[PDB]
Amino acid sequence: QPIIQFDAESWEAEFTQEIQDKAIEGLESGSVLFFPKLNFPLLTEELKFLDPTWVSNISYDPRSATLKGVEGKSEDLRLLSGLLKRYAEKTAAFLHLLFPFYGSSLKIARTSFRPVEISGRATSARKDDTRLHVDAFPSSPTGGERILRVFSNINPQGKPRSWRIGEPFQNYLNHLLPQLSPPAPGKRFLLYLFGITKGYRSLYDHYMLELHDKGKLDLEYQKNSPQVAFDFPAGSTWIVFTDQVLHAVDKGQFLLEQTFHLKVNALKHPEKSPLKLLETALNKKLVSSESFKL
Ligand X SMILES: O=C(O)CCC(=O)C(=O)O
State the residues that interact with ligand X by CB under 6 A: 114, 129, 135, 161, 242, 247, 249, 255, 257
Minimum CB separation of residue 264 from Fe ion in Å reads 19
Query: Which residues contribute to the site for Fe ion (CB under 5 A)?
Result: 135, 242
Q: Which of these, 112, 99, 151, 25, lies nearest to 262 by C-alpha position?
A: 99
- The C-alpha angle with vertex 293 and arms to 289 and 294, in degrees rounded to 5, equals 135
206 annotated among ligand-binding-site residues: no
- Which lies closer to ligand X via its Cβ, residue 115 or residue 144? 115
Would the annotation count 161 as a binding residue? yes
The DSSP secondary structure of 51-72, one letter per residue, reads SGGG---EEEETTTTEEES---
Strand partners of residue 4? 33
Q: Which is nearer to ligand X, 169 or 188 (CB)?
A: 169
Handedness of CA 267, 273, 275, 278 (dihedral sign): positive
Question: Shortest approach of ligand X to residue 78 CB, angstroms?
Answer: 26
Distance CA 38, CA 154 (A): 11
C-beta closer to Fe ion: residue 11 or 145: 145
Residue 197 DSSP SS3: coil
Whether residue 149 is annotated as binding a ligand: the answer is yes
Query: Residue 179: CB partners within 8 Å, gap ≥ 6?
Result: 210, 214, 218
Work out what residue 255 binds among ligand X, Fe ion, none; the CB cut-off runs from 5 to 8 Å by kind.
ligand X
Minimum CB–partner distance for residue 242 and Fe ion (Å): 5
Taking Cα atoms as reference points, which of 153, 63, 80, 70 lies closest to residue 117? 153
Q: How far is the CB of 284 from ligand X (least distance, A)?
A: 27
Binding at 161: pick from ligand X, Fe ion, none (beta carbon under 5-8 Å per type): ligand X
Which entry of ligand X, Fe ion, none binds 205, CB below 5 to 8 A by partner kind?
none
Residue nearest to ligand X (CB): 249
Shortest distance in whole angstroms from residue 242 CB to ligand X? 5
* Residues contributing to the annotated binding site for succinate: 114, 161, 163
